Amino acid sequence: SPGIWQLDCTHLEGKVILVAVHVASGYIEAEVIPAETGQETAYFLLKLAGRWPVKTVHTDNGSNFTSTTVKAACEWAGIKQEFGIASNKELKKIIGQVRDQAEHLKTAVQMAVFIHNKKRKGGIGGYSAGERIVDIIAT
Amino acid sequence: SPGIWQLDCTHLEGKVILVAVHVASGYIEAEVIPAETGQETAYFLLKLAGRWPVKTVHTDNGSNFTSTTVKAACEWAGIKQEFGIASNKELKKIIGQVRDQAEHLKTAVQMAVFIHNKKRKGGIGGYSAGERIVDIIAT
Ligand SMILES: Cc1ccc2oc(C#Cc3cccs3)c(CC(=O)O)c2c1
Ligand SMILES: Cc1ccc2oc(C#Cc3cccs3)c(CC(=O)O)c2c1
After folding, report:
1. Residue of chain B minimizing CA distance to A117
2. Which residues of B lie closer than 8 Å to A, measured between beta carbons?
3. Alpha-carbon span A7 to B114, nearest angstrom
4. In angstroms, what CA-CA distances link A9 with A21, A39, B9, B59, B74?
5. Domains, chain B, ordered by start
6. Three-state SS at B34
7. How far is CA A64 from CA A15, A70, A103, A125, in A?
8. Partner-chain residue, chosen from A43, A114, A138, that has the shortest CB–CB distance to B49
9. Do A20 and A30 touch, CB atoms closer than 8 A?
């Protein structure tokens, strides 16, 4: 289905990175938050769903099932939250390659997301993740 | 061309809203920032261009031409900044319709962006802005 995402967290320099993956394309969006709160996840989901068809979000643990705001975001935007489900180390190599081009970690995280979404697999031919998600939604 | 945007600022409850419009689709992305700094605009442009083809950004005044970080963002991401160029009152009516569904202004701003991007013109038939930008990029 064209609206399936995976949501996860990752950690770098004592900061928290929210990562959404569009499962069929590998497109990612990410955001650095001060702390891993309900509100932050709800805000991120609402932005995401305003940009793409988001039908179902898959997570790997219980954290998101206990936030009052995440459930009000789910419901407002029409997002099914489903339990049950790598990319998270591609990110980190690219973050390492750019880290000292940016003062702020968040900048490096977005430079990493950029390159993840724009590049071709193996550097030649076919579609980027950013091309594939557009191509998937367009049909 | 498929990569042309308009960037502008707007103000509500003493907070600053950055608005990017995809000129051919009317798709919008927006973000509430504490203050109207170079860094914030650069960060927003870098996120945007990591998500969509952004070839040229049109602005209406000189503010963006005097930020060292905005120029380093332009150059890093391959974005031509061009001088010379409404939607900004559709936003505000919808913000008013949702305002007391959300504690934070930023939430109302994203609920407004959601509805702006998802709705059909006149409420029936054709494509939403979010459909049109995908349809434009897919060709
Ligand atoms: C080449 C490039 C592209 C985008 C960029 O965004 C920022 C920023 C920022 C912030 C916004 C709010 C709080 S910090 C920077 C500056 C850095 O990180 O070097 C930067 C540099
Ligand atoms: C239905 C719905 C959907 C998304 C939402 O995001 C937030 C938030 C937030 C924040 C993140 C960081 C600092 S404040 C809220 C709560 C509110 O504004 O009522 C909310 C409610």
Report:
1. B50
2. 29, 43, 46-47, 49-52, 76-77, 101, 104, 106-107, 110-111, 113-114, 117-118, 130, 134-135, 137-138
3. 19
4. 11, 14, 31, 35, 29
5. 4-133 (3.30.420.10)
6. coil
7. 18, 7, 31, 38
8. A114
9. yes
